[PDB]
Design goal:
- 2 copies of one chain form a homodimer.
- Chain A is of the alpha/beta class and 220 residues long.
- The first copy, chain A, folds into 2 domains: 145 residues, HAD superfamily/HAD-like (Rossmann fold), CATH 3.40.50.1000; 75 residues, Putative phosphatase, domain 2 (DNA polymerase, domain 1), CATH 1.10.150.
- Chain A is built from 9 helices and 8 strands.
- In chain A, the strands form 2 sheets. In chain A, strands 5-4-1-6-7-8 form a 6-stranded parallel β-sheet.
- In chain A, strand 4, helix 6 and strand 5 form a beta-alpha-beta unit.
- In chain A, helix 1 packs across helix 2 and helix 2 packs across helix 3.
- The radius of gyration of chain A is 17 Å and the shape is globular.
- Chains A and B meet through helix 2, helix 3 and helix 8 of A and helix 2, helix 3 and helix 8 of B.
- It is classed as dehalogenase.
- The entry lists the keywords dehalogenase, hydrolase.
């Protein structure tokens, strides 16, 4: 039986579409382009640095990813504007069903936690700004292990902090590549697919594929 | 002094634009889309499987990447068509300056080698079809180490096969992320940038940035 749930941050709980708008305000007409490439570089850099054994915290990785993005687009990025766009991640709005769903799952007595890339301080900030803080038992960052997902050492961390075995911790994520990693590790996996995307072809399939957190509650 | 050179395959020696056309013939009008996404998934899958410690040879990784690509685009991919597109990589044409440049570098007495993802048999096939076989001392695959780049264990392989120390082996590649990996490892790095792209923001800069192999010869 699942006694705890490990949540993903962007795309699972919080909507990042906010950042797109904040980018377009900085560089009018380019918003969708900037945010699209910026997000991919953030992913790539965490993966690539992990393979090379050259870690840096997510904040740095986010700035670097933006710097490359603008340089690649022919956009001039000053320090001031770079901080603003980066601060945009600390002010995300959750998906509509999120608040109620979290309250209901906590009612059911499940231990809830968040495992993200950023510092614990920033993770706290996002959930506090959204007034959701009180619903989480653990706020985890990959920083302690100096590596990023899907390196299995990040998953153990989630397992250790929760004081439960992986088979009793539901891994919830909107990223198929992450759900694949979790699935290989041992966590029962729940893929959050809202916009009709397909699963990655790396030998895995999630235990459950849902369209929102509303469906997650029904499982309990 | 550089006594040997380790070459990258696609984009450095051989032009992959050929595959784009072969894709468009299979799915008329979609060629650029298919090949674009297919190449990114190939990269991602090698990286992601390496981090998860779940290796499979490049052939499998190429098929999976195509399967996802078509499924994601709403395209129906049968076995027959899947093999054809995959065979397209074994029939690439080199860049115009390549042949002469390789002949000239061998004239200068440098040990030349290729370090790619595919099987040694397929690597051999590409260079043989292009009539370039005789110019290479070593044809290397990552298969022996069961991991992909930029995992440092792949770079050591290139170092061991050549019987030289890394500082005496020029690492030539068209991929900035790979040049970063090599650079961190210890290899003097030469980035081949033909189409005016920018370098990745992961803390590195190549020793040389050139626009073709013609410039590589001038360095010696």
């Amino acid at each position: 039986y699942i006694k705890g749930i490990a949540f993903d941050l962007y795309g699972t709980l919080f909507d990042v579409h906010s950042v797109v708008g904040r980018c377009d305000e900085a560089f009018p007409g380019r918003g969708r382009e900037i945010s699209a490439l910026w997000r991919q570089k953030q992913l790539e850099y965490t993966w690539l640095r992990s393979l090379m054994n050259r870690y840096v915290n997510f904040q740095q990785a986010t700035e670097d990813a933006l710097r490359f993005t603008c340089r690649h687009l022919g956009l001039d990025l000053d320090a001031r504007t770079r901080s603003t766009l980066c601060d945009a991640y600390l002010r995300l709005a959750p998906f509509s069903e999120v608040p109620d769903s979290l309250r209901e799952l906590k009612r059911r007595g499940l231990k809830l936690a968040i495992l993200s890339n950023g510092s614990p301080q920033s993770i706290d900030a996002v959930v506090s700004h959204a007034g959701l803080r009180d619903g989480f038992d653990h706020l985890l960052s990959v920083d302690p292990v100096q590596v990023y997902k899907p390196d299995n050492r990040v998953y153990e961390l989630a397992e250790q902090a929760l004081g439960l075995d992986r088979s009793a911790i539901l891994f919830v994520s909107s990223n198929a590549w992450d759900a694949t990693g979790a699935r290989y590790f041992g966590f029962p996996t729940c893929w959050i697919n809202r916009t009709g995307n397909v699963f990655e072809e790396m030998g895995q399939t999630p235990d459950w594929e849902v369209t929102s957190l509303r469906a997650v509650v029904e499982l309990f």
